[PDB]
Design a protein around this nucleic acid. Structure first.
Lengths: 92, 91
DNA sequence: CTCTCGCGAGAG
DNA sequence: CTCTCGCGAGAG
């Protein structure tokens, strides 16, 4: 699993969160992003509810590497939160 | 309100979050940080308990300014989240 | 305390 | 859709 330049060409380059919003939209359906989390962990505030399965960690790490290449001043922890932010803003 | 170099000098320079954690512990008591949020916004979740009041926004901008001088490639909004993380760290 | 991290309101 | 930003479990 390898993100290509033609996928990267379609994505806002002004800001990392904007790049992530565009790239996730190129790679994934809305239904997929609404039903998965970054890590598959239970939310501290979800009691006795379905736990969303994790993204493919190979796809996560490719997403992070491509983002890091275009945004050298963003770091691992920030890009992870940004992928989570996009996933959190998708509804079934 | 101005942050002095003697306060900056007591702080980890390796990572912005470590710097912010050190800097805020030099400026504020644990109990102050325990009981404030960055902006004083009402929780999206716990709507019953009293709302933690905001930090002083002048102090916030002086912290972001001093952070930005040492970590010029960290953006303003990340620094705001890091100030938030450290307040949360005191709860 | 510290970090990571899924979630939510409510206003753009 | 998109952002800011507070809660809070669990492992460290």
């Amino acid at each position: 699993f390898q993100i290509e330049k033609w996928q990267i060409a379609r994505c806002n380059k002004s800001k990392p969160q904007k790049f992530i919003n565009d790239l996730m939209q190129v790679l994934y359906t809305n239904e997929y992003m609404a039903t998965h989390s970054l890590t598959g962990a239970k939310s501290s505030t979800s009691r006795d509810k379905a736990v969303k399965p994790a993204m493919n960690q190979n796809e996560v790490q490719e997403i992070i590497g491509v983002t890091k290449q275009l945004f050298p001043n963003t770091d691992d922890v920030s890009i992870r939160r940004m992928i989570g932010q996009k996933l959190n803003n998708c509804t079934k």
